[PDB]
Design a protein around this ligand. Structure first.
Ligand SMILES: CC(=O)N[C@@H]1[C@@H](O[C@@H]2O[C@H](CO)[C@H](O)[C@H](O[C@]3(C(=O)O)C[C@H](O)[C@@H](NC(C)=O)[C@H]([C@H](O)[C@H](O)CO)O3)[C@H]2O)[C@@H](O)[C@@H](CO)O[C@@H]1O
Ligand code: NA
Ligand code: NA
Length: 206
């Protein structure tokens, strides 16, 4: 419906135990948008039902002339906090639709096709908290023996990893095994692992 408002969204990935925030752009040939609803595909024309319940949205400056032009599109905020108890797997995604109304009452048409993803149709993908972070290379810790780290040496490795990764959640737990393997356990209890050879060396070989 070229007469209806056009929507540009994106690939909206979110993570357990983390806040998220994305913005969609909306334009109309009349230059004006009066209403914005984000919804599940089911329900009919007047339906505004949206799940999961933690998905919120907001749109400022509605019903003003020239609020949805090509030069300055109307922006809709899509945001929330992902609970720690969400189920994550290859199917833990939710396909939703952004519908906008122009002053005439023309509304964006919902088309059920993957080729429309990133437009009025978008996918909200829920992943585990570990997926948000890529643990950065730590400075190497030199230990006495790579096959047997002391308690003090294990604490040192954990400290080095933390110092190199300030963006990792403060309450995330970093543990180190007796062979130097690092495990980062995030608040949602998912994990990242760092091999011993990227964090420790010894001087046992001449
Ligand atoms: C209830 C019913 O029969 N609805 C059909 C409707 O079917 C849905 O169509 C969507 C696209 O418009 C999606 O393809 C729905 O599938 C998914 C999704 O949202 O992407 C697949 C996911 O794997 C799944 N996620 C999980 C965690 O299970 C979700 C999820 O179950 C629901 O979104 C939760 O609300 O579903 C698909 O179910 C569609 O066929 C229309 C025709 O346009 O007809 C009915 O409304
Ligand atoms: Na229009
Ligand atoms: Na990770």
């Amino acid at each position: 419906d070229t007469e209806a408002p056009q929507v540009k969204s994106g690939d909206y990935v979110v993570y357990r135990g983390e806040s998220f925030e994305y913005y969609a752009e909306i334009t109309d040939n009349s230059g004006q948008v009066n209403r914005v609803v984000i919804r599940n595909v089911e329900g009919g024309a007047n339906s505004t039902y949206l799940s999961p319940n933690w998905v919120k949205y907001s749109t400022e400056n509605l019903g003003r002339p020239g609020n949805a032009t090509v030069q300055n599109p109307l922006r809709t905020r899509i945001f929330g906090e992902v609970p720690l108890n969400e189920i994550v797997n290859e199917k833990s995604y939710y396909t939703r639709y952004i519908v906008a109304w122009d002053p005439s009452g023309n509304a964006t048409q919902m088309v059920d096709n993957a080729n429309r993803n990133g437009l009025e149709r978008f996918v909200l993908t829920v992943k585990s908290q570990n997926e948000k972070y890529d643990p950065a290379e730590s400075s190497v810790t030199y230990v006495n023996n790579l096959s047997n780290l002391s308690t003090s040496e294990r604490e040192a490795v954990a400290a080095a990893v933390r110092a190199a990764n300030p963006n990792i959640p403060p309450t995330a737990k970093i543990t180190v095994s007796q062979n130097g393997t690092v495990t980062i356990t995030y608040p949602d209890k998912s994990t990242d692992t760092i091999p011993a050879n990227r964090v420790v060396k010894d001087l046992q070989i001449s």
